[PDB]
Structure formats: structure tokens, C-alpha cells
Amino acid sequence: ATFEIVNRCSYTVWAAASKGDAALDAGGRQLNSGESWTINVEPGTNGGKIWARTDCYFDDSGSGICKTGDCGGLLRCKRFGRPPTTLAEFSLNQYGKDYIDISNIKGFNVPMDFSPTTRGCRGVRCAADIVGQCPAKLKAPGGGCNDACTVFQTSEYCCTTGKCGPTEYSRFFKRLCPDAFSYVLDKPTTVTCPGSSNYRVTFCPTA
Numbered sequence: 001a002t003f004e005i006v007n008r009c010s011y012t013v014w015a016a017a018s019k020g021d022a023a024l025d026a027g028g029r030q031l032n033s034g035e036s037w038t039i040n041v042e043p044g045t046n047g048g049k050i051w052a053r054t055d056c057y058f059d060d061s062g063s064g065i066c067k068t069g070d071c072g073g074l075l076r077c078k079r080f081g082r083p084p085t086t087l088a089e090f091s092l093n094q095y096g097k098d099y100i101d102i103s104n105i106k107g108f109n110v111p112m113d114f115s116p117t118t119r120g121c122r123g124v125r126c127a128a129d130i131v132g133q134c135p136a137k138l139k140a141p142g143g144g145c146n147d148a149c150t151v152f153q154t155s156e157y158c159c160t161t162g163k164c165g166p167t168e169y170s171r172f173f174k175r176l177c178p179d180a181f182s183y184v185l186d187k188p189t190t191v192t193c194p195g196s197s198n199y200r201v202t203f204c205p206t207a
Contacts (some may be wrong), residue, residue, distance in 0.1 A: 001041045001092055002198045004117065005050065007031035009204035013052040013110060016069060016077040017041070024048055027076040030056075031203075043093045043196060050088040051081055052110040052203050054143055067142045068109040083107040084144035086126060086180075088114040088201045098193040102126045103181040104173040108134075109144035113205035121193040126177040127206045135172055147173075147183075159184035 005015045012032050017024040017039055025039035041048060053069030062075035069081035084107025090100045101124060102114050108130040115123025134145035148169035149157040156164050162185075166174070170183035179189050 001043060001045075001098075001196060002038055002117075003041060003050065004036055004038045004198075004200045005031065006036045006200060006202045007033060007052075007204070008202055009033060009110065011054070013054060013203055014056045014058075014066060014069075014075065015050065015201075015203075016053055016071055016081055017048070017050045018071065018077045018080055019045055019048045020080055021078075023076060023078050024050075027078060028053075028071075028074065030075075041092065045090070045092045046094065048090050048092070049080060050090075050201050051085045052112070053081060053085075054109060068140070068144045083150045084109045084140050084146045086110050086112045088112060090114075090199070093195045096195045098195055098197050099190050100124065100193060100199070101181060101188075101190040102177075102179065104130075104177060105147055105149075105181050105184060107138075107140070107144055107146045107150060108173070108177075110203050111205065113200075113202045115200050115202075116193050116197045117200050118194070118197045121191050121197070124179050124189065124191060125205060126180040127204075128176040130173070130176045133172075133176060135169065138169060138172075157183075 053066035055067035058064035071077035111127040113125040174182035
């Protein structure tokens with residue numbers, strides 16, 4: 001499956017793609033404002049994620065640091081990134097179907113649209129100005145908006161026991177971005193696509 005990853009932000013981002021225990025494709029790449037990077041993701045990829053990282057410095061061997069989304073200091077990511085990170089999430093070819101969603105469960109750093117480029121489903125979008133409207137206690141000093149679990153580490157926010165509900169903090173994400181997951185047990189906003197669809201992830205889809 002191809003994913004075209006487009007940076008429409010006015011700033012540079014460093015796209016990352018991983019399934020948690022491995023990179024997808026090269027796993028990571030700098031995208032200047034306007035650049036596109038097409039990756040190939042193996043069919044049957046389960047629990048893949050794509051995200052953006054901001055304000056990064058990498059040396060010549062590709063080691064360094066990112067203010068948001070850092071995945072162990074590597075340009076080419078092999079694991080998931082450090083919150084806050086808006087996440088494009090997908091599982092491909094799962095009993096004949098693809099599943100996609102956007103999640104705010106690990107916070108928000110960059111607005112995002114996640115759409116199929118092939119026929120038969122709709123895309124999802126989380127493009128509101130969450131960083132600017134973020135509640136004080138969630139503001140990440142390093143940039144972006146943390147989820148409450150990251151900030152407070154309680155069972156209620158992290159949904160450890162499997163029984164949590166919505167909270168003042170999850171309701172903020174959900175009000176700004178109704179079509180993204182705002183906490184673990186949020187009413188699903190996952191989109192079912194035909195198996196083997198292709199996709200585009202766009203950072204800053206709106207002016």
C-alpha cells in the first residue's frame with residue numbers, strides 16, 4: 001500500500017512511520033514545506049502509525065533529537081514517538097478490510113488529514129488549532145498539547161483497568177476534533193476501507 005505523505009505546513013516536519021517494533025519503509029524523513037514523500041507499507045500491517053515531528057536536529061549518522069514525536073533520537077524511526085503527537089493510525093488487510101483513524105490519545109502537535117486516494121470510503125481530519133487553545137495544564141513546554149494520561153499518569157486518564165470514561169481533558173480534544181479518538185474508550189471514529197486501499201496523510205491540510 002502506498003501512503004503519500006504531504007507537508008502543507010509553513011515549517012519543516014520530519015515525518016515518521018512505524019508499527020511499534022519496526023519501521024515502515026525508511027521509517028522517517030525530512031519534509032520541507034510543500035514536500036511529499038511516498039512510502040510503501042507491507043500489506044497486513046497491523047497497528048501502523050504515521051506522525052510528524054517538529055524542531056529536530058540530526059547529525060550525519062541520523063542521530064539527534066526532536067521537540068515532539070522523538071522516537072529514540074533516530075531520523076529513521078523504528079518505534080513510536082514521544083508525545084505529544086497527532087497520530088494517523090491504520091491496520092491493513094484485516095479480514096479483507098483496511099481500518100484508519102486519527103487519534104489524539106497521545107496529544108496533538110500538528111494538524112492532519114488522513115484520506116484514501118482510492119475509491120470507496122471517506123477520510124478523517126483533525127485540523128483545528130488545538131495547540132493555541134490547549135488547556136494550561138496540558139501545554140507541552142517543548143511544543144504541542146499533551147494528553148492527560150501523559151501529564152497525570154492516573155488509571156482514569158490511562159484507562160488502565162479497561163473501565164474509564166470521558167474527562168474534562170478528553171472533552172477538550174473531542175470538542176476541537178470530533179473525528180479523532182479523544183480517549184481510549186471513545187466511541188470509535190474508525191473508518192473501514194476496502195482492503196489494499198492507498199492513502200494520503202497531509203500535515204496542515206487547511207490554510
